[PDB]
Amino acid sequence: MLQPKRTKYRKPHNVSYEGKAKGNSYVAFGEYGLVATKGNWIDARAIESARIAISKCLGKTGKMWIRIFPHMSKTKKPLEVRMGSGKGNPEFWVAVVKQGTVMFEVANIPESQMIKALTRAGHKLPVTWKILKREE
Amino acid sequence: AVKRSTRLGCNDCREINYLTFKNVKKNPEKLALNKFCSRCRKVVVHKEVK
Amino acid sequence: NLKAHYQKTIAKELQKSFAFSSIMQVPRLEKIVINMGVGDAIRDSKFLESALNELHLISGQKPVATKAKNAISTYKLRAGQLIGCKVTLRGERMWAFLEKLIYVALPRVRDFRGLSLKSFDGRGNYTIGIKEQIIFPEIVYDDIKRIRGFDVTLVTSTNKDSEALALLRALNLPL
Amino acid sequence: MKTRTEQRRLRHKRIVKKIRATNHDNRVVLMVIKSLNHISVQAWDFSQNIVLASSSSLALKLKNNAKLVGQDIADKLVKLKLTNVVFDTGGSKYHGRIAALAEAARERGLNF
Amino acid sequence: FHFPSQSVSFKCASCSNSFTIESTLKQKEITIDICGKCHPFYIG
RNA sequence: UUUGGUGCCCAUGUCGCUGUGGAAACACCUGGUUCCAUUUCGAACCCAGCAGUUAAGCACAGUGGAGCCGAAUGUAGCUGCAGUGAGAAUAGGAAAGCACCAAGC
RNA sequence: CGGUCGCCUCCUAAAAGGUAACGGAGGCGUACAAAGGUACCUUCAGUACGGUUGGAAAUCGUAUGUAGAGUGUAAUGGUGUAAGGGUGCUUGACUGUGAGACAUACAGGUCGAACAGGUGAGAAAUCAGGUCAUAGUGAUCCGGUGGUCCAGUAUGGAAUGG
RNA sequence: UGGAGGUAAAGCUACUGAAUGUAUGAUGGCGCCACCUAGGCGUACUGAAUACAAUUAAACUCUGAAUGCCAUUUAUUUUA
Numbered sequence A: 001m002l003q004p005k006r007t008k009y010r011k012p013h014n015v016s017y018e019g020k021a022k023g024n025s026y027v028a029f030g031e032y033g034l035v036a037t038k039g040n041w042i043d044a045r046a047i048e049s050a051r052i053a054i055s056k057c058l059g060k061t062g063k064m065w066i067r068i069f070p071h072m073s074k075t076k077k078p079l080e081v082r083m084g085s086g087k088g089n090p091e092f093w094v095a096v097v098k099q100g101t102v103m104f105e106v107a108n109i110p111e112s113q114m115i116k117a118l119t120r121a122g123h124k125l126p127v128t129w130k131i132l133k134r135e136e
Numbered sequence B: 001a002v003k004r005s006t007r008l009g010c011n012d013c014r015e016i017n018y019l020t021f022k023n024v025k026k027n028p029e030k031l032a033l034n035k036f037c038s039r040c041r042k043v044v045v046h047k048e049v050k
Numbered sequence C: 001n002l003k004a005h006y007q008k009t010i011a012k013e014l015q016k017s018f019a020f021s022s023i024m025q026v027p028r029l030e031k032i033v034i035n036m037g038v039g040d041a042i043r044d045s046k047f048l049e050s051a052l053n054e055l056h057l058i059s060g061q062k063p064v065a066t067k068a069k070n071a072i073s074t075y076k077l078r079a080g081q082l083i084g085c086k087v088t089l090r091g092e093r094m095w096a097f098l099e100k101l102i103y104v105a106l107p108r109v110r111d112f113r114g115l116s117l118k119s120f121d122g123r124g125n126y127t128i129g130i131k132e133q134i135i136f137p138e139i140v141y142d143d144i145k146r147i148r149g150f151d152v153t154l155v156t157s158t159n160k161d162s163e164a165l166a167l168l169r170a171l172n173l174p175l
Numbered sequence D: 001m002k003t004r005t006e007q008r009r010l011r012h013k014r015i016v017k018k019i020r021a022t023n024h025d026n027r028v029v030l031m032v033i034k035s036l037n038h039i040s041v042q043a044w045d046f047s048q049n050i051v052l053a054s055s056s057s058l059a060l061k062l063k064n065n066a067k068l069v070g071q072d073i074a075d076k077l078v079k080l081k082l083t084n085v086v087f088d089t090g091g092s093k094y095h096g097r098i099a100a101l102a103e104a105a106r107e108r109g110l111n112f
Numbered sequence E: 001f002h003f004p005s006q007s008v009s010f011k012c013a014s015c016s017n018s019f020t021i022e023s024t025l026k027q028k029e030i031t032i033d034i035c036g037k038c039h040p041f042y043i044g
Numbered sequence F: 001u002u003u004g005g006u007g008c009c010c011a012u013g014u015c016g017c018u019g020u021g022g023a024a025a026c027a028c029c030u031g032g033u034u035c036c037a038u039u040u041c042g043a044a045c046c047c048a049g050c051a052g053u054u055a056a057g058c059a060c061a062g063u064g065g066a067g068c069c070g071a072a073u074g075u076a077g078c079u080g081c082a083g084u085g086a087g088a089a090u091a092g093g094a095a096a097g098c099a100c101c102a103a104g105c
Numbered sequence G: 001c002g003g004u005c006g007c008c009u010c011c012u013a014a015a016a017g018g019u020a021a022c023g024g025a026g027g028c029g030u031a032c033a034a035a036g037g038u039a040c041c042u043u044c045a046g047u048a049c050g051g052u053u054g055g056a057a058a059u060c061g062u063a064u065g066u067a068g069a070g071u072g073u074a075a076u077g078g079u080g081u082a083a084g085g086g087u088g089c090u091u092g093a094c095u096g097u098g099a100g101a102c103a104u105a106c107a108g109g110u111c112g113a114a115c116a117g118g119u120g121a122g123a124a125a126u127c128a129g130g131u132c133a134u135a136g137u138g139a140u141c142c143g144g145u146g147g148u149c150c151a152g153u154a155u156g157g158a159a160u161g162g
Numbered sequence H: 001u002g003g004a005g006g007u008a009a010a011g012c013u014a015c016u017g018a019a020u021g022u023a024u025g026a027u028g029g030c031g032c033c034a035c036c037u038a039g040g041c042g043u044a045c046u047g048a049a050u051a052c053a054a055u056u057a058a059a060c061u062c063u064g065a066a067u068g069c070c071a072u073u074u075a076u077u078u079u080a
């Protein structure tokens, strides 16, 4: 579970992901990267599931770089309660993912194996994924 | 509230002209300044008044 | 005076030792300071007066005591409560109180063999520490209940430390 | 650390800042510069940043007790009918030679 | 304004020499055992 | 025109590195007995003297090291799909500039 | 039931100003005769080398650094020769006023040139009507206290009022 | 037409928090021998500090628009 060790302010404004990927536009460390075509919020749990999928299918030869991180927290009002009279406690952390952010990327392992690893990863994430390759 | 203020009065004519603030707990000394007095028309020594 | 020997020989000596052709590229000794660090005045042991008097006795400079510029809870020294003392002596006093050490005091040390191999700053300064002020002649046996040392420095007008080597060697210091 | 001359320039900057902020009338400021060898004076007319008159030891005088750099500048300004100035010690202190200059300047028809 | 400093002298006990600079002036021309040319590190 | 002073400008003005110069000047320097002064001291302030100095400050030439500045194109946002246009990045500039005064020129 | 009830600063507040919610964070119900006013002088904390007691860390000198220091206190804004630290002298932490503006439903709040009296600091210009700025406080009635070129139920006083 | 401003966006060796990797590796922890204290050995790991590449922010800012706003100019209109 990825989680900031400690944050300044516990209850911040939600960040709309409707943009075109300020930062992380392009793959930067490996040969192949996973891109999104619809911005969304993927929490720490989904990052964990994607990471473990890539690691399990990667074998003991290659490397995986995670680019996004659940910097932002998020709240959830307890159930069966009227509205108002405060702001609910923070529950789960989430990484904002704009459209077109290369979030995962792999290295040092055959081509087809990397494509399969990325496909096995992007099925855990809600964002409609896509495959990009490093430039030259 | 805390009633920390105090009043200064001239000594020649004994009016109670001025008002100021003084914290007794540190400097127990009675203030003795010299300021303008409207009756006396000059700078006279003012000293504290209860 | 030791200044006599300097202004008689040293200028020519170190001018010829290093190819300068500038009579005062030779290093010049600029000031000397004395510090003790009287920290046994937690609140008031003797309130530093013994230190002030004895340091007045050794040097013609009137001693001055510095106030703490920090706040330390580990001791009773926070934001005030002056500790230590400081002399910054010069003129005839600088040259004379210097030799008065090297010709009187250091032969009277517990063991004066050698130093200054590694005590240079590397920018033209030097320091000497003394573990007890009772050794020096300008004092009687009576003192504070504790006897402390001294911190003295030699700062010159050159930044290259080998020049300081040359100046202090030309002045016959114990290396 | 400082060079005894950049520091003096700094004190002068302090003084000129106070003057340029405070001088509500258009009084011409009378700057004196003190050098180890001798002394000089110039009268900066602010609000136009030009110089009106000046004086120095180099008016065929000797090495600066030479308050003569006061009488001549007093004459030059009173010929311009201003005679209401404000003094400027550069970075120096209003003492010694500067005082001997300023008093001579005052006692010949100036008002400052 | 300070203690009465002066030009006091000294007296060597072994080096057969003398010094005279400044100290408390109550003990003019004082003798000390280990002189200026006494300590082995000074000479030798 | 060059030197010194100084105001305006606020780094394309700096920080530094290598050399050149000091007649007049600017500092250094020499002394502290005087006016004056140090939380203590002729360091500094302040006097009165210029024997020596180009060492250092000051100026001048070269230095593309750091720092600084930064075009065009293209892009992101905008405001009724065209005009608007940045940031970051880049080529690259850059060893300051504007005046007045005193000198010898 | 619980919580809150006035005032101050940030964010929300959409690049003027304003702008709600049981929206997100926090403070005040002051403190200082010097932490006021003025003249003069001085300008970081930190780190590295160097040094008896003395230690991670006291202090000492040296450089380095461009503010991470300080600014009585909450946060913000501003401020490195200042609005910060030290010193000498004082008390303008004045009286009587107030053109012209700000923001305001009213009440109230805020800023202030300039003028007269008599002062402080300073050679002088100048500065000073409390502090670097923003909170630090509560109407009216009633009654009391001090001064008085006010009246005093016929007159002189007094009581009682102003 | 001039001007206040600090948003959208962007950026983070330009500070504050958060924070990914490679290289150098301190602080340490696992063992470890001497020695009973001053300490050495390689550290599958936590990562001081720095370099290089790459990130996030209502209460982060070296930077930064357009619209909107204020006042003014010119033309026209309205007596509110």
Ligand SMILES: [Mg+2]
Pocket: none
């Ligand atoms: Mg103040």
Ligand SMILES: [Mg+2]
Pocket: G035, G131
């Ligand atoms: Mg205050």
Ligand SMILES: [Mg+2]
Pocket: G131
């Ligand atoms: Mg206050």
Ligand SMILES: [Mg+2]
Pocket: none
């Ligand atoms: Mg009657």
Ligand SMILES: [Mg+2]
Pocket: none
């Ligand atoms: Mg944004």
Ligand SMILES: [Zn+2]
Pocket: B010, B011, B012, B013, B014, B015, B037, B038, B039, B040, B044
């Ligand atoms: Zn009176």
